[PDB]
Design a protein around this nucleic acid. Sequence first.
RNA 1: CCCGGCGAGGGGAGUGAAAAAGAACCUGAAACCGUGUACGUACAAGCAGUGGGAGCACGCUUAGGCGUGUGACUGCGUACC
RNA 2: UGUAACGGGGCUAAACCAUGCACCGAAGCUGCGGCAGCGACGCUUAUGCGUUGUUGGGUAGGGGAGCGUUCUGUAAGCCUGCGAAGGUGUGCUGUGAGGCAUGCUGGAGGUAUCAGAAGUGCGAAUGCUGACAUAAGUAACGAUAAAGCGGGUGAAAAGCCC
Lengths: 103, 56, 117, 142, 110, 47, 150
Amino acid sequence: MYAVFQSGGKQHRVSEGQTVRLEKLDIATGETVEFAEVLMIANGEEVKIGVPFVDGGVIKAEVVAHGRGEKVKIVKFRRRKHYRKQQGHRQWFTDVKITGISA
Amino acid sequence: AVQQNKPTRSKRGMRRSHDALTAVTSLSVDKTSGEKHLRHHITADGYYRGRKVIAK
Amino acid sequence: ARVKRGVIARARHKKILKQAKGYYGARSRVYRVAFQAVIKAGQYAYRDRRQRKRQFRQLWIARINAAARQNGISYSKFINGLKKASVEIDRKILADIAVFDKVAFTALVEKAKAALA
Amino acid sequence: MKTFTAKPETVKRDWYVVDATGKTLGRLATELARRLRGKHKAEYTPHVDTGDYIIVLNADKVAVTGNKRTDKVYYHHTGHIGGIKQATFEEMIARRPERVIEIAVKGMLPKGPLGRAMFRKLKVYAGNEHNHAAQQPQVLDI
Amino acid sequence: METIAKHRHARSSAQKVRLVADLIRGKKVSQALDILTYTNKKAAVLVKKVLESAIANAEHNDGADIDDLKVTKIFVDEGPSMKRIMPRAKGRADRILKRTSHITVVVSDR
Amino acid sequence: RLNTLSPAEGSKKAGKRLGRGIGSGLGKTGGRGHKGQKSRSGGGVRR
Amino acid sequence: VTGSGKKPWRQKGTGRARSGSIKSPIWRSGGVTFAARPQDHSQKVNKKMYRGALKSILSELVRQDRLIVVEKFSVEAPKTKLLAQKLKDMALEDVLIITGELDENLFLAARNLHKVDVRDATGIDPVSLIAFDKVVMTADAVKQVEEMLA
RNA sequence: CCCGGCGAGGGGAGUGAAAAAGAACCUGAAACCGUGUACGUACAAGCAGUGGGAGCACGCUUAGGCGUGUGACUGCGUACC
RNA sequence: UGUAACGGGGCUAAACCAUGCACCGAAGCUGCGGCAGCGACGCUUAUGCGUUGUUGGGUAGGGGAGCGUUCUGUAAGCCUGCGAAGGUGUGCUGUGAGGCAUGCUGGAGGUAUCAGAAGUGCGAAUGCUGACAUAAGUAACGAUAAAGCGGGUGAAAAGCCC
Ligand SMILES: [Mg+2]
Ligand SMILES: [Mg+2]
Ligand SMILES: [Mg+2]
Ligand SMILES: [Mg+2]
Ligand SMILES: [Mg+2]
Ligand SMILES: [Mg+2]
Ligand SMILES: [Mg+2]
Ligand SMILES: [Mg+2]
Ligand SMILES: [Mg+2]
Ligand SMILES: [Mg+2]
Ligand SMILES: [Mg+2]
Ligand SMILES: [Mg+2]
Ligand SMILES: [Mg+2]
Ligand SMILES: [Mg+2]
Ligand SMILES: [Mg+2]
Ligand SMILES: [Mg+2]
Ligand SMILES: [Mg+2]
Ligand SMILES: [Mg+2]
Ligand SMILES: [Mg+2]
Ligand SMILES: [Mg+2]
Ligand SMILES: [Mg+2]
Ligand SMILES: [Mg+2]
Ligand SMILES: [Mg+2]
Ligand SMILES: [Mg+2]
Ligand SMILES: [Mg+2]
Ligand SMILES: [Mg+2]
Ligand SMILES: [Mg+2]
Ligand SMILES: [Mg+2]
Ligand SMILES: [Mg+2]
Ligand SMILES: [Mg+2]
Ligand SMILES: [Mg+2]
Ligand SMILES: [Mg+2]
Ligand SMILES: [Mg+2]
Ligand SMILES: [Mg+2]
Ligand SMILES: [Mg+2]
Ligand SMILES: [Mg+2]
Ligand SMILES: [Mg+2]
Ligand SMILES: [Mg+2]
Ligand SMILES: [Mg+2]
Ligand SMILES: [Mg+2]
Ligand SMILES: [Mg+2]
Ligand SMILES: [Mg+2]
Ligand SMILES: [Mg+2]
Ligand SMILES: [Mg+2]
Ligand SMILES: [Mg+2]
Ligand SMILES: [Mg+2]
Ligand SMILES: [Mg+2]
Ligand SMILES: [Mg+2]
Ligand SMILES: [Mg+2]
Ligand SMILES: [Mg+2]
Ligand SMILES: [Mg+2]
Ligand SMILES: [Mg+2]
Ligand SMILES: [Mg+2]
């Protein structure tokens, strides 16, 4: 029993109670989100998506606080050509604990 | 002839892995006097295989 | 107004050296060498980030194939099938069910073998 | 979540047997090759040996195609003076046939350590039998 | 009690000494006195005299009892080097460091 | 208030420093290109 | 830099690099590439711009009730403790106090009081006119300054 | 006081806020050289990192298959001016 | 020098031509999140914004905007032996030069903010001065006139004394 779904431009497979990290959603720091576009559900017998997304599939989960991941150095260097620029980047994310998964 | 690059401190060590010193584990006790000695060597007090030799 | 210069000198050197922890020989001990070793790591980094997505995709694929192969089908067709299967978009990494939930993977070889037929 | 990864201390393996007879030496080597590298499963772990143990009966009776049976390279250099050594397919089959399947698949397995290891999973034998009864191998095809 | 004893500015290299020091690290004091005794190297007398001093310290400044004493730690570091000049053929002049060592012994029971 | 006043936007501008590293904008060659008379300390040609 | 101009060593032949004078700013003991010289950092300040500025900064003190103007202001003898009181009494501790014709007593007072200074009208400089919390300035003076900035 | 050659040197004791100020004496950096510990390494080829990653060893929250040190194996990979 | 004229294995198709349908494949395109530049809509003007369209490889070189250091003013202020500067860990933080907090060391100085001024930033110049590696515990210990033994003295004697 599990489900897969689109979220941050990427897909995730998951169970309820389980927490996953996604690209920043503009949702309240605590409220409950619905993911109306799940593309698979599971058991001993499971629903692949005829078209994309199983018929009446939808997942629930509460946003469990937002964040910024760890910092990454962007180094650029053109040996012998007198050029280099370095630039930092962090990248926002929001976490969800997945309550739903209604097939 | 001379190196072209500086040798690592690491290689230096390996070169010396054979430079270690060996203990003795080859010393005995005169049967007459208590004396410890090098095997086949006269004792400090001047003995050897029991038997004081070397008056002095 | 002579300017000390050498406490901020220390500053930078220590900073670069810092990032050199782990690098062998004077790569972590000596600034000149540290500093280069550091700069390239940032390059190798930039590069490998995009390479990362490459490497993984081509992992998922080979194994997806391994799985479909087990189920009597080549990755190609499979994916085509899945494609033709009333659209049906769903990741290659997500087809990791290949690894764990095998009976499920098998259930896709069907949904694909079908619409594909 | 980080994608799966086969661990060395928990991999399956399983012995198998093949009779590489009238089989075209190389179209066979290829399937061997891949099974050693575990390319038919959760190879999903190219940094880990997840193949199976295959054993090859009757190496001598191996197929070739075209004039290969008598026109094939087979060159090594002993590292001396000018010691290039050459022998021909038939000539290899004469002394140590097993070597043929080895050099073939060995050139289809990767680089170093890993591949070097995946190759210890391939026991040949030129005759018809073998002494691995102990592992009780199950036979396959291709 | 740990108790140490050290010889600073030893007139030996360090490399030269570390050799002898090595013969001895972590042995029962008693046996070290023998090993050292039969080692034909300037450094031995040097290290021997340190060990002894360590012992006499650990014996007269602390709990003591040589019998239960082990050279738990021994380690020779490098001292400052007297620089000299060496006349060489054709006017050339070379350096030469006369080096020194900092011999340290540490003798305890636990 | 002796430290609340300031110069009008634009009044006093930087001043090319030059010779001060890559990111600086004019390190090395300090903006005077490669070789020839016109580089060179005191390198020019009469009016 | 004291020392000879002799070439430290032959141009070519020794492994050594160049060398022309042991006073090379790149050599140790002596150099300074652009050795400094005594300099006159005076500026110009157009009169009308100076007068403009005071009339400006003045105006602001008013806008901030920081200029407290008074008819006459002094002390009957040269005694700081005196000036001390007057100031305590008027609730001033940081003052410019710019007097009309400027007396003497008032001067030797505050010549030890840290946060206060006394000038005549014809004195008064721009920076200090900003520095102090409160500038006082007698009406007598406000006249001399009034027409001094015209 | 003790070891030491009536040494050098050192350990105690005592002085001092401090001797982790002991006279080569404030602070005491870097190169360079050592002792200890964890992890690796004796079938394996190259700028030595970077991407993946087992094991091992120590921090997470009351396991969530994280973090940190190491790093078997593996993709890519010829320093700088 | 060595297979050495498919990169290799190996291939009778894993070559070659035709046709058809797939799949892999880039920092190209798309998706999601985020920054900037140059525009205008629409909300609405000491205008920022849902924005909204578009753009953001770069040597010589031009333009723009910033960081930090030393010193001056702001400062008879703020911080500081309930521990400064410096050293050294650690954690956090900014697009970056950087910043902040804090353990240890250190033991007396440090300075916010806004302005002012430069001996203002280093890896290279066979750069300068100092320190320390490397080869290496290798060459060598300076005439192949030469040494041996007993005895002394000494903490120790091939080298001193007899
Ligand atoms: Mg040796
Ligand atoms: Mg100064
Ligand atoms: Mg270090
Ligand atoms: Mg891509
Ligand atoms: Mg061949
Ligand atoms: Mg051969
Ligand atoms: Mg390869
Ligand atoms: Mg030298
Ligand atoms: Mg500019
Ligand atoms: Mg430029
Ligand atoms: Mg120009
Ligand atoms: Mg040039
Ligand atoms: Mg030019
Ligand atoms: Mg001079
Ligand atoms: Mg002359
Ligand atoms: Mg000549
Ligand atoms: Mg040279
Ligand atoms: Mg000078
Ligand atoms: Mg005038
Ligand atoms: Mg005594
Ligand atoms: Mg003494
Ligand atoms: Mg100390
Ligand atoms: Mg200290
Ligand atoms: Mg000191
Ligand atoms: Mg140090
Ligand atoms: Mg190793
Ligand atoms: Mg090698
Ligand atoms: Mg990694
Ligand atoms: Mg523990
Ligand atoms: Mg811990
Ligand atoms: Mg690697
Ligand atoms: Mg030939
Ligand atoms: Mg080719
Ligand atoms: Mg693009
Ligand atoms: Mg497209
Ligand atoms: Mg976007
Ligand atoms: Mg409008
Ligand atoms: Mg650009
Ligand atoms: Mg572009
Ligand atoms: Mg200031
Ligand atoms: Mg200062
Ligand atoms: Mg900042
Ligand atoms: Mg300078
Ligand atoms: Mg330097
Ligand atoms: Mg440069
Ligand atoms: Mg050496
Ligand atoms: Mg040699
Ligand atoms: Mg030799
Ligand atoms: Mg010799
Ligand atoms: Mg000679
Ligand atoms: Mg001689
Ligand atoms: Mg004699
Ligand atoms: Mg002689």
